[PDB]
């Protein structure tokens, strides 16, 4: 496990170096500093009732642990995850594989979690979505309903905090009028303007209005590599889902060099939608609604030593 410690500037300032970029791509944008909202209340629905306090990204295996064959021996445990990254009773958002290995299925995972430690009692609020043998449609399912565990696989990109009400940078952006989506749109704007003092953010949206090109992977891995992107979008199930979707973003604005995924939102939804997050498909009339912080920290754990740049949109 190593540790990198991010550039951290105020709140004030990011919010300021954040709505600059972000209304170079949306037509009606605010970003602001603000109370975190309660959580734990809809369409959130949390264990917890904010993102704040001891702030830090977890970065865990790899694309390159799926890709080209998978190594189905990687296996992570989220509640030991939060002791490693100096957080025990951490609350952790973000996107990975599910684990396969309590499932009995290959799944997009979205951790919600607050971990156990000595004044917390741990709750799994995960959701995880797969692909229905039914009619190739998407399932989501709570895993706290299915499994009782703190089980993960392969990858995760996760935000990590106290989970503690107070300041936070909510981030409003209407109509898209540029190219980027608006997890891309935020990462590059840090990185233009903080360039070599690297960045790193987390915390949840809701898109509110939209639609948007999601994907899950199938429920059993590939018996031959996939050696392109073109041959895992091949494999990937593809769709288009509608709001609201509740998202959970982890985004990097330069990687220092850990091998890290820069960008990887997944999300749910109370309509049975869920997956992991490429761009909306009606620009005109998308609505985003977001709560984030930056990271103090970034923890790099079992980084493959093998390692390629495919499979990471
Ligand atoms: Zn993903």
């Not at 300032?13 to 209304?23: D, I, N, S, Y």
């Not at 997009?108 to 430690?117: G, H, K, Y």
């Not at 009619?135 to 990858?155: I, N, R």
């Not at 091998?259 to 761009?279: C, K, N, P, V």
Request: proline content about 7%.
């Amino acid at each position: 496990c190593a540790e990198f410690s991010f550039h951290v500037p105020s709140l004030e300032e990011l919010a300021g170096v954040m709505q600059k970029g972000l209304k170079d791509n949306f037509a009606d944008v605010q970003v602001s500093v603000v109370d975190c909202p309660d959580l734990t209340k809809e369409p959130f629905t949390f264990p917890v009732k904010g993102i704040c306090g001891k702030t830090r990204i977890a970065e865990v295996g790899g694309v390159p642990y799926l890709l080209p064959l998978v190594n189905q021996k990687k296996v992570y445990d989220l509640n030991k995850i939060a002791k490693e990254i100096k957080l025990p009773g951490a609350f952790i958002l973000g996107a990975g594989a599910g684990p396969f290995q309590t499932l009995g299925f290959n799944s997009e995972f979205m951790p919600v979690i607050q971990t156990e430690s000595e004044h917390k009692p741990p709750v799994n609020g995960s959701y995880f979505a797969h692909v229905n043998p039914a009619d190739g449609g998407c399932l989501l399912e709570k895993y706290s309903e299915k499994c009782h565990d703190f089980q993960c696989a392969l990858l995760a990109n996760l935000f990590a905090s106290e989970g503690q009400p107070g300041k936070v940078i909510e981030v409003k952006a209407k109509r898209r009028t540029g190219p980027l989506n608006f997890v891309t749109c935020m990462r590059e704007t840090l990185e233009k303007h903080y360039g070599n003092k690297p960045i790193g953010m987390g915390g949840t949206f809701i898109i509110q209005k939209g639609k948007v090109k999601s994907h899950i992977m199938p429920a059993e891995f590939s018996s031959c590599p996939l050696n392109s992107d073109e041959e895992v979008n091949k494999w990937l199930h593809f769709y288009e889902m509608k709001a609201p979707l509740v998202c959970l973003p982890v985004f990097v604005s330069r990687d220092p060099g850990f091998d890290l995924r820069l960008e990887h939102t997944h999300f749910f939804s109370r309509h049975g939608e869920g997956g992991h997050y490429h761009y909306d498909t009606t620009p005109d009339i998308v609505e985003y609604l977001g709560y984030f912080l930056p990271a103090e920290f970034l923890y790099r754990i079992d980084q493959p030593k093998e390692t390629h740049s495919i499979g990471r949109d």
